[PDB]
Design a protein around this ligand. Structure first.
Ligand code: TP7
Ligand code: TP7
Ligand code: COM
Ligand code: CL
Lengths: 431, 578, 278, 431
């Protein structure tokens, strides 16, 4: 199998790319994106400083009277940043990195790959361990006061298994909150991803599908012949293989409806020989079959994402995506008599997410979902990239937007070249 | 409808509505709201609210239809419990208003199974201590004093009031007939006696169980209901550990606290324990022995229908369904995972009015028809998509026609979600009866739901068909979290983890395949036996009858009340009545 | 496009309602201001609120997709997102919930439709949704007896009809005149309006049978399996292809033990009479 | 800081080794060990075939009737093994490895490191996913029967988060059961480690402590100056640095009491100048202090493992270890006026584990504990190695022994050179 890779403007990036070259297991760009995703922390030092000064060093709605200390962490930001960097370093010239941001109000921390022996959550712990000792040493905190520093940095942990109230913010979560073995890279909010690609839809879809598919491998879903179907989905839906994705959007973006995209995709599938007549029914309706079912699935998934982009961008809003994915799947099946994206699983997740974005029971708008979420985890990688796309496209119509929930990620992770331009990163490495 | 009124919906429809069952028209707006018969509880509730408000320091208001949605512009209908003649008020099916439903789940939650053979093995290995039927008998006597909260070793211990914990005791069962004969019969849950059911001869069910269990000795221990209510399901295996621990020390003259005691702890809490269910991923964090981790097959095995009515696979379905609707939908989805008014009728639709009953008996009939009148014959080389599709389409047309042709039935099942649940259950039953196999029931489930959407132009609620669209794919998948045998699924199987109107039916399908297959259990021989225990408060052999008694406040078997130790109730003033 | 399978007039109704080239018949003409009254998100004459500045006076993210997809007029203006919602009687409503979403996402740009048994909601930018509401209330997809505008308390799609053929409404949003004419006397969530809004007379039973998208084996509707085997033939096919694919995505039907011999089946037998009543 | 590394027979392995050279972050052997620990699965093919034949394909006490199938997995062990290998392999020549054992009855599986993108439990899932497709393919399992094969290989998962009823056995557990971020390498039962080194106490202690300290780093307990103390505890207690551990056991092995070992170690501490007089009290009792407190701790921690070995080897029983550690800690404090191992944390864990090995409430014999266990997790690395030593030393006097709980591990992993001889591997790396 071979594909050409294209960018978000319909311009070709690489040709005659063997399908294996974009595999999460082999592509150096993907491997790098994964590595950065588990290593990179963001810290709001100004907010942390304020935590210590007010005694707001615990969880939501908590305040401890009498333990207010004034620790000039923003003032001494440069010393803190260097202490941390030196602690994180295992050997000179290694991939350890620490950068101050916004006049030292904020900080990026990247422990070196070598500190991760078995547990990806070292990216969090090394930083948290380094930061709290850094503060204590640099600001000359006494024994008596040391525990307040622990609380400021580690939050309610270990009393709460979740150190989420602490200072170091990752894209990923602690291992316990993962819904299964191999779900690590799925536990990343859509709003964080949307913020990270700075609200550019195709980059968001691409980045999100790169992470989803890598997770799919890690979950054990890509063994033997099962692999091919995932790599095709990734290439076509995620990486705009042979310009199918961009083409569908461009051709229908002016006055096209969701259905228009779907039908244009069926017609392209036919033209390309992906699907062909199996049987003509009494009404004249033709049921189609596909010699290469996995390839059809790739075409369908691309149709799905393109349909989402067209409709959501028309509304300049994110909320439509679940109902968009549903009718994308349903309609493509009714048009052809073939099975929809991920053999019904995508439609399934579109039903639950439709429900849990319009009801009292849970969920929220699309930006609070993610691959690990019980509501949206069901499809085998093709589903959540549509959500990120939708929340990039959203013109802040929603209350829980990336601007509200994820500013920190936009600011700190936004300038990471592999995050900003994931498709070009992959295409380069696949050459 | 089905030819036999004992299983069809015609008596229920006749007795619910003034018009004929096939009537297409009725009358609205003339019932006086809750002035009508079916408003009786709501009028009761209004009278009570006033007292509640009077008792509050700032007169914070409570129940008030005028502050919400007043009820009864349409007929407020009663319901008939499936395969009974018991009518009930709708309001009386809410789990909060129904002590029988509460007891049914508390009974399940407070149970733990624990092998004894390893403990004997440990006694032998480390101490060379003799174990005989007599010492086992003494052990069980001590355990039945200890388990509810009685002291066996220390001086100056406080103890529990027996009438507060009178539902707690322990029995043993075993495939070893000679051991059972030798032990004091007061402590025995007798398999030959509870499973004399057979198909071609007496005791075949017992035979199956004793062969599966073998010459092993197993304990079923029930903890006090009040313990389930004060705490959670995670207490249960731990409580067994503690009291079995204390019993061992006494019955075998050990040091009260030596290294052997430590190994007995691990034996009891880990090595030989069998729980109702395991914990949950932390988003829906829960202790052990809660509904979230309980497989469908265990739900089914907890009913007695197959031992009491061995030739009636659909009664087995419908009794398992009644337990499952209440447990998974009313309590788990409707409370543990949400709360409020909740999901009473999403559940009760599957155990009232003989509607699901009607579909499933018709389903079995159709499936047998296609199986050439030989139940469970469609297996191996006879099992293919053609015959399945024929069966499913036939029964789906049957069931969906009922709702359309007898509009009282649709009016009772007013939400599409329960119509879907029930039509699909009917299709599954048809396949269960033809095949004696659970997995293909999933193929019927998928096609029924897809056929439903296609026929009617609608299905269930906003997020009803998540698992349904996943069903075909998950059918025979072997991927990580995507596949697994039907019997072993439950509400932690990912696409099953959020929605009402499925788990009820599934509990039925899993039971039907197996009863049709002449199997004495679905998933667990151990739990099958344990739940046969006739000293349990709730009657696991007549589920819908129990629900009916709870509804009409005639139920006498609730445990764990505290009336014996209080002088009054919150919000209710003491003093004699005038 | 094919749209959907099916050989009966009900299947053709489905295909037409989905087909943007097909012009839906207009039964009534509700003035825009009366439409605004019914939706009750704003008062007629009241200026559209904004949730963000018009896109033109704003710098959007440098997004290729925003670049090539034109916003609707509602989106460009930064309108709120509001909604319209319908309840469709099981007694031969002209259109059914699922077919509404098919219709909406084929015919309209920039919409958020949701399908349930007793309600179908469409969300869109306020001015956009006002336009969609008028089109859908005016045309053959709305019958004044078997369809209802309802943003809450939707109960009734599956409830028996009244003496006059009206679907139950617990909020009593409609009133019926002696001549059959239906008027809305409350807004779509049961709130008071400054004036009543006349919708018109209901279609006759024969017309409803002619216009409906539902298969219904009662009261003279289409019996899906006896009158249109193609319908389940193709739906089942989709079902089995999803089944095969979940097991092994690359697998063809012919490689499966006991796989389908063909689309359709040879020995389907029915166990109800036509009209179902026995 | 420098140490000499001695073997389990008191022979010097390497002289003047720089303290950093035995760091889990740096030593290539410790690194390979961690690698082998998360990658290596064991599969009882014989027992698996029986599951499918009996329909016992679920959890404890469960049997599904009517789904029995005769799958000749052991007869086709060859085909299956190769099929799994070919699925696990990422690139030709990589570190993918699959072996058959006991005439094909058991099987060792090691996915290549390259499949582990972020989540260590890929070791489990890759093997599980490969194993279940391999069986379905080689044994010609039809679509209808495929879910049974999933049950047999994956256990109750996903309904149960824990796939422990499944067919692939690792030393480590699933991420959800780790007691915190960084705890991965701690979730390894003492009995499994004891079987793995085939009941040779010192290799058991060393292997266990290599893993424990690897974990301490990953927890974030080794940042800044804290790092030094952990490397010292590893070198002395774990690696018999300067032959201190051995000479302590050797000198008291004939008729020494636990107490004799304590004092031997104390006098060695003075002689080495680790501690020295601080103040003579009125009774004559002298309070000691230590210029290098971290070095003292490393000494007390070796004395602790020494005492345990001497007293347990005397009884040839595992059960005394908790109470041994307790009094090792207590008596060394009462003798010096200095703080005990891990500054009281080890005595702490000695108290809980004493309790929870002689009472009704939980735990069991020392063999059922592990670093991650709530009872024994408290010491920062020094504690659990004592338990592995004790259960190596056990003459099968306990019911829940490695012979009973862990034979699969001893059989399959026992042949791995880095497990069989971790101290040698580490020293050759430190050259
Ligand atoms: C989705 C999830 O909610 P969150 O997205 O985490 O708020 C989940 N709710 C449940 O799935 C609701 C199930 C019961 C109510 C719906 C009945 S159909 C839960 O609370 O864990
Ligand atoms: C140790 C652990 O037991 P296991 O080792 O898992 O059997 C744990 N027990 C509790 O810590 C017992 C605490 C209450 C009884 C003793 C009070 S001093 C538990 O059951 O989770
Ligand atoms: O949200 S829905 O309206 O679909 C139903 C929940 S009861
Ligand atoms: Cl006994």
């Amino acid at each position: 199998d071979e594909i050409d890779l294209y960018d978000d403007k319909g311009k070709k990036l690489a040709a005659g790319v063997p399908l294996q070259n974009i595999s999460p297991l082999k592509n150096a760009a993907i491997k790098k994106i994964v590595n950065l995703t588990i290593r990179t922390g963001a810290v709001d030092l100004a907010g942390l400083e304020k935590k210590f000064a007010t005694g707001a060093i615990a969880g939501r709605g908590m305040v401890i009277r009498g333990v207010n200390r004034n620790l000039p962490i923003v003032d001494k930001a440069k010393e803190i940043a260097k202490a941390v960097e030196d602690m994180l370093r295992v050997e000179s010239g290694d991939d350890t990195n620490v950068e101050l941001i916004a006049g030292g109000k904020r900080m990026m921390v990247q422990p070196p790959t070598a500190r991760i022996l078995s547990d990806y959550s070292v990216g969090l712990t090394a930083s948290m361990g380094a930061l709290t000792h850094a503060i204590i040493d640099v600001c000359n905190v006494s024994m008596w006061d040391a525990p307040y520093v622990h609380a400021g940095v580690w939050g309610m942990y270990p009393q709460n298994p979740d150190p989420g109230d602490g200072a170091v913010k990752m894209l990923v979560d602690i291992p316990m909150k993962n819904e299964g073995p191999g779900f690590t890279l799925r536990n990343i909010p859509v709003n964080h991803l949307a913020a990270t690609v700075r609200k550019r839809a195709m980059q968001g879809a691409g980045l999100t599908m790169i992470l989803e598919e890598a997770a799919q491998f890690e979950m054990g879903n890509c063994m033997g012949p099962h692999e091919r179907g995932h790599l095709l989905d990734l290439a076509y839906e995620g990486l705009n293989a042979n310009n199918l994705l961009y083409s569908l959007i461009k051709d229908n973006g002016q006055d096209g409806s969701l259905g228009d995209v779907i039908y244009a995709a069926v017609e392209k599938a036919k033209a390309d020989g992906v699907i062909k007549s199996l049987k003509k029914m009494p009404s004249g309706f033709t049921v189609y079959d596909a010699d290469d079912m996995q390839l059809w699935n790739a075409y369908a998934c691309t149709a799905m994402l393109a349909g989402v982009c067209v409709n959501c961008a028309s509304m300049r809003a994110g909320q439509p995506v679940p109902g968009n994915i549903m009718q994308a799947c349903c309609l493509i099946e009714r048009e052809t008599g073939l099975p929809g994206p991920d053999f019904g699983m995508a439609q399934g997740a579109s039903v639950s997410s439709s429900f849990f974005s319009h009801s009292i029971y849970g969920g929220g708008g699309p930006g609070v979902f993610y691959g690990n979420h019980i509501v949206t985890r069901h499809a085998k990688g093709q589903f959540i990239p549509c959500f990120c796309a939708a929340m990039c496209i959203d013109a802040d119509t929603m209350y829980f937007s990336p601007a509200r929930t994820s500013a920190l990620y936009g600011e700190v992770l936004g300038a990471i070249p592999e995050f900003a331009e994931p498709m070009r990163a992959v295409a380069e490495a696949a050459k | 409808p089905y030819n036999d009124i004992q299983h069809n919906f015609l008596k229920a429809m006749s007795d619910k509505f003034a018009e004929k069952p096939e009537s297409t028209a009725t009358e609205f707006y003339t019932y006086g709201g809750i002035a009508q018969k079916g408003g009786m509880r709501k009028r009761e509730f209004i009278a009570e609210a006033s007292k509640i408000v009077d008792s509050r320091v700032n007169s914070t208001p409570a129940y008030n239809p005028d502050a919400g949605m007043p009820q009864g512009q349409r007929y407020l209908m009663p319901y008939m419990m499936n395969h009974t003649d018991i009518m009930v008020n709708a309001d009386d099916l809410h789990w909060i208003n129904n002590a029988a439903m509460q007891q049914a789940w508390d009974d399940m939650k407070r149970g733990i199974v624990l092998g004894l053979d390893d403990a004997h093995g440990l006694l032998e290995a480390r101490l060379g201590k003799e174990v005989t039927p007599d010492t086992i008998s003494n052990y069980m006597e001590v355990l039945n004093h200890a388990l509810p909260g009685g002291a066996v070793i220390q001086e100056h211990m406080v103890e529990t009031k027996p009438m507060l914990v009178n539902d707690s005791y322990a029995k043993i069962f075993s495939g070893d007939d000679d051991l059972v004969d030798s032990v004091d019969r007061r402590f025995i849950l007798d398999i030959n006696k509870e499973f004399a059911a057979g198909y071609d001869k007496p005791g075949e069910q017992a035979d199956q169980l004793k062969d599966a269990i073998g010459k092993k000795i197993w304990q079923i221990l029930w903890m006090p209901t009040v313990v389930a209510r004060q705490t959670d399901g995670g207490t249960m295996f731990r409580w067994v550990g503690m009291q079995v621990g204390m019993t061992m020390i006494n019955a075998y003259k050990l040091c009260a606290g030596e290294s052997v005691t430590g190994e007995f702890a691990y034996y009891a809490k880990h090595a030989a324990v069998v729980q109702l269910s395991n914990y949950m991923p932390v988003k829906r964090a829960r202790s052990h022995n809660e509904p979230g981790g309980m497989p469908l097959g265990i739900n089914a095995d907890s009913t007695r229908s197959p031992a009491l009515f061995p030739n009636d696979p659909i009664r087995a379905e419908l009794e398992s369904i009644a337990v499952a609707a209440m447990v998974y939908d009313q309590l788990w989805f409707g409370t543990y995972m949400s709360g409020g008014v909740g999901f009473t009728q999403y559940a009760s639709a599957t155990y009232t009015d003989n509607i699901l009953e009607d579909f499933c008996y018709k389903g079995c009939e159709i499936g047998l028809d296609y199986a050439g009148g030989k139940m469970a014959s469609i297996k191996g080389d006879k099992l293919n998509m053609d015959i399945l599709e024929e069966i499913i389409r036939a029964e789906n047309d049957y069931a969906l026609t009922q709702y359309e042709a007898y509009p009282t039935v649709a009016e009772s099942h007013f939400g599409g979600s329960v119509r879907a649940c029930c039509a699909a259950a009917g299709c599954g039953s048809a396949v269960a009866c033809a095949t004696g196999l659970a997995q293909p029931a999933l193929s019927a489930w998928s096609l029924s739901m897809l056929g439903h959407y296609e026929r009617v132009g609608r299905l269930g609620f906003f997020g009803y068909d998540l698992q349904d669209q996943c069903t075909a794919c998950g059918s025979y998948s072997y991927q990580s979290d995507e596949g697994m045998p039907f019997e072993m699924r439950g509400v932690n199987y990912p696409n099953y983890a959020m929605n009402v109107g499925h788990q009820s039916a599934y509990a039925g399908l899993v039971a039907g395949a197996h009863s049709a297959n002449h199997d004495a259990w679905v998933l667990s021989p151990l739990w099958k036996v344990a739940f046969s225990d006739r000293d349990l408060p709730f009657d696991r052999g007549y589920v819908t009858r129990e629900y009916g008694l709870g509804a009409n406040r005639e139920y006498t078997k609730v445990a764990g009340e505290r009336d014996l130790i209080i002088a009054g109730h919150y919000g209710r003033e003491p003093g004699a009545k005038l | 496009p094919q749209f959907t399978a099916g050989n009966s007039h009900v299947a053709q109704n489905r295909r037409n309602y989905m087909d943007p080239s097909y012009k839906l018949e207009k039964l009534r003409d509700i003035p825009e201001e009366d439409i605004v009254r019914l939706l009750a998100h704003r008062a007629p004459g009241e200026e559209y609120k904004s949730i963000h500045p018009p896109l033109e006076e704003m710098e959007e993210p440098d997004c290729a997709v925003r670049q090539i997809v034109k916003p609707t007029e509602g989106a460009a203006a930064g309108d709120r997102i509001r909604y319209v919602q319908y309840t469709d009687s099981m007694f031969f409503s002209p259109i059914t919930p699922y077919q509404r979403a098919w219709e909406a996402l084929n015919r309209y740009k920039g919409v958020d439709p949701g399908v349930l048994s007793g309600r179908t909601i469409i969300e869109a930018r306020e001015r956009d949704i006002e336009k969609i509401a008028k089109i859908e209330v005016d045309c053959e997809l709305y019958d004044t007896a078997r369809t209802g505008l309802r943003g809450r308390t939707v109960h009734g799609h599956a409830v028996r009809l009244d003496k006059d053929g009206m679907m139950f409404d617990a909020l009593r949003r409609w009133s019926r005149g002696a001549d059959g004419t239906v008027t809305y006397v409350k807004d779509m969530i049961g709130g008071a309006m400054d004036k009543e809004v006349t919708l018109g007379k209901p279609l006759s039973d024969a017309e409803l049978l002619k216009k409906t998208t539902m298969y219904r084996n009662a009261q003279g509707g289409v019996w899906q399996e006896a009158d249109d085997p193609e319908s389940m033939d193709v739906t089942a096919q989709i079902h089995w292809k999803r089944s095969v694919g979940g097991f092994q995505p690359w697998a063809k039907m012919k490689d499966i033990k006991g796989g389908k011999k063909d689309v359709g089946v040879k020995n389907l037998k029915l166990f109800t009479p036509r009209g179902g009543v026995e």
